Amino acid sequence: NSTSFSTFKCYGVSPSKLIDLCFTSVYADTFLIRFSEVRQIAPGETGVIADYNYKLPDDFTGCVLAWNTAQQDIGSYFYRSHRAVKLKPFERDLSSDENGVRTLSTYDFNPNVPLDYQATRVVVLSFELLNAPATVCGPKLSTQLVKNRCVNFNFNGLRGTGVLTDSDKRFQSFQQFGRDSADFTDSVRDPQTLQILDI
Amino acid sequence: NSTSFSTFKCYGVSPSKLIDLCFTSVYADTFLIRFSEVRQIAPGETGVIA
Amino acid sequence: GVRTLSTYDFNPNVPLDYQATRVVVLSFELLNAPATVCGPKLSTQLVKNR
Amino acid sequence: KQNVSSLMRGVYYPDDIYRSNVNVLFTVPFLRFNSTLTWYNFWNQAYTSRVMEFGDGIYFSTVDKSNAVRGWIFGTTLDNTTQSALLINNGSLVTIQVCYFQFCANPAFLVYISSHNCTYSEVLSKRLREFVFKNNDGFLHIYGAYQPHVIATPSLPSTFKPLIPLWKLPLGLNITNFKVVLTFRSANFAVGSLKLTTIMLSFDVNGTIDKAVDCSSDPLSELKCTLKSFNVSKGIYPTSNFR
Ligand SMILES: *[C@@H]1O[C@H](CO)[C@@H](O[C@@H]2O[C@H](CO)[C@@H](O)[C@H](O)[C@H]2NC(C)=O)[C@H](O)[C@H]1NC(C)=O
Numbered sequence: 233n234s235t236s237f238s239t240f241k242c243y244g245v246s247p248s249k250l251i252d253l254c255f256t257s258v259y260a261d262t263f264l265i266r267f268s269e270v271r272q273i274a275p276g277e278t279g280v281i282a283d284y285n286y287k288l289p290d291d292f293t294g295c296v297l298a299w300n301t302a303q304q305d306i307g308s309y310f311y312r313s314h315r316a317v318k319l320k321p322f323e324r325d326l327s328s329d330e331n332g333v334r335t336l337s338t339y340d341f342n343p344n345v346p347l348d349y350q351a352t353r354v355v356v357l358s359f360e361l362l363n364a365p366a367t368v369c370g371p372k373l374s375t376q377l378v379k380n381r382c383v384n385f386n387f388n389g390l391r392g393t394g395v396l397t398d399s400d401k402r403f404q405s406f407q408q409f410g411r412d413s414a415d416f417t418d419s420v421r422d423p424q425t426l427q428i429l430d431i
Numbered sequence: 432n433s434t435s436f437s438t439f440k441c442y443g444v445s446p447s448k449l450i451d452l453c454f455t456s457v458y459a460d461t462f463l464i465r466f467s468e469v470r471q472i473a474p475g476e477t478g479v480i481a
Numbered sequence: 482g483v484r485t486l487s488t489y490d491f492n493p494n495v496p497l498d499y500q501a502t503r504v505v506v507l508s509f510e511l512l513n514a515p516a517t518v519c520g521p522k523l524s525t526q527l528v529k530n531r
Numbered sequence: 532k533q534n535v536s537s538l539m540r541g542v543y544y545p546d547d548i549y550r551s552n553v554n555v556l557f558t559v560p561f562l563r564f565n566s567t568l569t570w571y572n573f574w575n576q577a578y579t580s581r582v583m584e585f586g587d588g589i590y591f592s593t594v595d596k597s598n599a600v601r602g603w604i605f606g607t608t609l610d611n612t613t614q615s616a617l618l619i620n621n622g623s624l625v626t627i628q629v630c631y632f633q634f635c636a637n638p639a640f641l642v643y644i645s646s647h648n649c650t651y652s653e654v655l656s657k658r659l660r661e662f663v664f665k666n667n668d669g670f671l672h673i674y675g676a677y678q679p680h681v682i683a684t685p686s687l688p689s690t691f692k693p694l695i696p697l698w699k700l701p702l703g704l705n706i707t708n709f710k711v712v713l714t715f716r717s718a719n720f721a722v723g724s725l726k727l728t729t730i731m732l733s734f735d736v737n738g739t740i741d742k743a744v745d746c747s748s749d750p751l752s753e754l755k756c757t758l759k760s761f762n763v764s765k766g767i768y769p770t771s772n773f774r
């Protein structure tokens with residue numbers, strides 16, 4: 233309600249599966265640009281934003297979420313356009329006079345400005361999913377653990393099909409699932425009433 | 432003429448081959464939404480309209 | 482129980498995202514059946530043994 | 532100020548994911564075997580300030596007589612023009628403060644006087660204490676090992692040590708210059724140099740690293756990386772081009 237996202241593009245995951253997954257950790261990079269420069273926030277692309285202000289890694293797994301707002305933010309903002317060397321991914325530079333001259337140019341934001349030159353708020357959510365106890369997780373409620381029946385299970389975003397049996401496998405304090413044979417998850421740990429279940 | 436098509440995306444077939452094909456049956460689902468929510472009408476997607 | 486249908490307004494003097502867009506989704510299928518809706522390409526003479 | 536050899540003391544965990552009972556290859560920054568160090572000793576008169584190169588990661592070490600080393604300063608100009616890391620160990624808390632620093636001549640305790648426009652400030656909280664620092668995709672990865680070092684004329688042991696991955700930082704800063712903070716009251720610290728290397732790493736049932744290969748130095752190491760094994764039968768084998 234009351235927020236219409238102009239661009240919601242997820243690389244590595246899909247926006248239809250963000251409910252089912254629990255992330256180990258999430259970072260949110262937040263900034264504000266022009267309306268036509270939203271298309272530059274994608275892995276493997278260059279421009280004035282993806283070269284001199286904010287670059288994305290090629291092994292990216294996240295979601296770019298950008299929405300137009302030409303009325304909330306009115307004024308003047310700064311951007312870099314004259315750097316000698318392109319940035320490494322996920323890096324920051326604050327040297328305004330690294331070339332001696334002012335390398336930070338201004339650009340204004342009024343409601344009565346043409347189409348491409350309007351303020352868009354961009355949030356890049358970079359999250360990683362691995363064998364760790366998750367912190368940020370989806371809104372799906374839990375169910376009763378049923379054993380000795382061929383069931384579909386969704387344990388912390390590890391969707392599978394099998395029979396859960398009480399087992400005594402040796403896990404660490406941080407392990408959430410067990411790889412065995414040719415990389416198959418066959419020993420897992422339920423997040424509520426933590427114990428070891430063999431699939 | 433007099434209709435500017437903002438988005439014409441075909442899945443399964445191509446817009447360059449719509450002349451060459453005769454369809455067995457066609458249905459048209461028609462409605463009206465906001466301008467930023469047109470990008471949600473695609474297979475495998477979530478939003479408010481999807 | 483509560484009203485699950487929310488309103489949204491449409492005026493000419495409204496920003497980029499909140500403007501009306503007419504959407505038609507044409508879902509057609511192609512299979513072994515006599516077609517009804519077909520393309521505008523004219524027929525030619527049936528020539529055999531070539 | 533002399534030179535010693537890296538006796539297999541630079542092996543760390545490359546990926547944060549979990550693996551067990553496998554032998555896998557990598558093309559990561561690594562400190563290869565039989566490398567060189569630049570370790571300096573503390574006398575009555577000794578080093579004051581030196582900017583050694585932070586070349587795509589650094590292997591730091593000490594022997595740590597009492598509490599001699601206090602931390603590290605990572606930067607690219609070491610002024611109040613570009614921000615700096617300044618890892619310290621005051622009291623019993625380890626803190627990181629990415630701010631603009633007008634620090635003094637020699638970094639010592641009993642390190643900085645002027646600090647403005649902080650972009651990051653976090654509090655974390657005969658002993659070897661060897662570290663590996665690297666920077667990748669705006670993240671400062673630190674891999675530490677608190678080994679109870681053996682006993683002067685200093686050197687390096689030959690016991691293998693899988694350096695446990697410590698905390699990493701979302702700093703968002705590029706680093707090419709580096710400085711060590713010491714204690715001046717009116718010990719040894721050692722500097723390595725990371726480079727891109729293909730390596731082979733084994734894992735046990737506990738997720739611990741058993742042994743390393745570093746197939747860029749020896750023909751037997753290259754053979755071990757070629758045949759995907761650590762035990763090699765007697766014979767002749769063609770090898771790849773890992774050197
Ligand atoms: C429209 O959006 C607003 C906020 O974006 C929602 O308002 C909240 O509604 C809940 C329950 O209805 C209240 O407890 C909060 O106090 C409201 N927040 C306010 C008034 O700031 C509202 O529910 C949304 N309506 C629809 C139909 O989605």
Ligand SMILES: *[C@@H]1O[C@H](CO)[C@@H](O[C@@H]2O[C@H](CO)[C@@H](O)[C@H](O)[C@H]2NC(C)=O)[C@H](O)[C@H]1NC(C)=O
Nearest residue numbers: 432433434435436437438439450503504505521
């Ligand atoms: C422009 O569009 C209009 C309407 O879409 C077309 O007008 C029709 O033209 C045909 C023949 O030219 C007439 O029989 C119709 O009565 C017209 N419809 C009207 C006036 O509503 C017109 O042909 C188009 N012109 C071009 C060049 O594409």
Ligand SMILES: *[C@@H]1O[C@H](CO)[C@@H](O)[C@H](O)[C@H]1NC(C)=O
Nearest residue numbers: 374375422423424425426427
């Ligand atoms: C709340 O969390 C604890 C800790 O794991 C768990 O044992 C308990 O069952 C949970 N309760 C509910 C209602 O989810």
Ligand SMILES: *[C@@H]1O[C@H](CO)[C@@H](O)[C@H](O)[C@H]1NC(C)=O
Nearest residue numbers: 532533534535567568569570
């Ligand atoms: C490293 O060892 C070589 C001898 O092989 C020596 O010449 C050189 O000075 C040493 N490096 C340093 C920094 O002392």
Ligand SMILES: *[C@@H]1O[C@H](CO)[C@@H](O)[C@H](O)[C@H]1NC(C)=O
Nearest residue numbers: 535536537538564565566749
């Ligand atoms: C590495 O260095 C040690 C000590 O200098 C030396 O004895 C050894 O032969 C070198 N090579 C290997 C492969 O260990």
Ligand SMILES: *[C@@H]1O[C@H](CO)[C@@H](O)[C@H](O)[C@H]1NC(C)=O
Nearest residue numbers: 609610611612632633634645
């Ligand atoms: C830090 O800023 C002060 C400003 O008063 C300046 O005097 C000082 O020289 C600066 N430090 C540098 C450039 O190393």
Ligand SMILES: *[C@@H]1O[C@H](CO)[C@@H](O)[C@H](O)[C@H]1NC(C)=O
Nearest residue numbers: 619620621622623624626654
């Ligand atoms: C160590 O430094 C931090 C950073 O300012 C400070 O909060 C803390 O009180 C200091 N502790 C001691 C013992 O000086």
Ligand SMILES: *[C@@H]1O[C@H](CO)[C@@H](O)[C@H](O)[C@H]1NC(C)=O
Nearest residue numbers: 326327328612631647648649
């Ligand atoms: C340093 O802090 C002051 C105080 O807010 C601010 O005005 C100035 O812009 C900051 N410096 C930079 C380079 O942003």
Ligand SMILES: *[C@@H]1O[C@H](CO)[C@@H](O)[C@H](O)[C@H]1NC(C)=O
Nearest residue numbers: 325327330607613705706707
């Ligand atoms: C780090 O940044 C500084 C200032 O932006 C620059 O001078 C230096 O070349 C950079 N080092 C790299 C990219 O290795």
Ligand SMILES: *[C@@H]1O[C@H](CO)[C@@H](O)[C@H](O)[C@H]1NC(C)=O
Nearest residue numbers: 402734735736737738739741
């Ligand atoms: C794993 O740790 C246990 C102690 O919990 C130990 O008994 C066992 O030998 C270890 N396994 C390996 C391969 O070192």
